[PDB]
Amino acid sequence: KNRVLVKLKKRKVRKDKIEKWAELALSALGLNNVELSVYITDDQEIRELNKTYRKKDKPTDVLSFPMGEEFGGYKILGDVVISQDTAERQARELGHSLEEEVKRLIVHGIVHLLGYDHEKGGEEEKKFRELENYVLSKLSK
Numbered sequence: 001k002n003r004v005l006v007k008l009k010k011r012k013v014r015k016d017k018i019e020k021w022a023e024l025a026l027s028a029l030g031l032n033n034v035e036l037s038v039y040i041t042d043d044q045e046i047r048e049l050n051k052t053y054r055k056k057d058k059p060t061d062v063l064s065f066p067m068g069e070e071f072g073g074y075k076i077l078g079d080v081v082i083s084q085d086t087a088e089r090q091a092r093e094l095g096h097s098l099e100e101e102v103k104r105l106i107v108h109g110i111v112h113l114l115g116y117d118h119e120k121g122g123e124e125e126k127k128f129r130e131l132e133n134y135v136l137s138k139l140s141k
Contacts, residue, residue, distance in 0.1 A: 002026045002034050009041040010084035013102050021103050021139060022080075025110050028138035035076045036113070038106060043085040061086045062105040064112035080109030107135045 004022045006015050022038050043059035051057045053065070060083065067078040082105045084098075091101035111132050118128040 002031060002036065005035065005037045007037065007039045009039070009045065011040070012084060012088075013040065013099055017099065018102065018106065021106050022110070024139050025107050025135050028135050029110070029114070031077075033074050035074065036110070037079040038109075039079060039081040040084055040102070041081060043083050046081060046083040046086070049081060059083055059086055061090060062109045062112075064109045066113055066115075077110075078113050080106060080113060082106070082109065103139065104136070107132055107139070111135070 004019050006018050018038055047059045049063055050060050062082045065079040067076045069076050087101045088098055091098045116128040118125040
């Protein structure tokens, strides 16, 4: 169906669970024949990424990097990179499990990868959140 490539530098959450959430999200989104990479790393690595790609010298929870190259119908969507370190702190602050936070961050990252951004606010945030909520509902059910 889709090719989900999961790479873990940090390993508190099972690889197969991350793979399954990602596959279920892609399926809820109706996508077929695409490639998605998910990387679970630490605060130091995500910080270098944030600095290099967003000019923000600090750690964060998730970053998404679009690629987009196509090979006869197969399309590479790109990468979602999540910091376990930050995810753990947020999970602590929000009162839920690390798994729940990682799952939510995967969905958040995928929606960004499809070209929605909530930071604008207004209509875009509206559409971003409706899509994210829909996907989450599909992973709950």
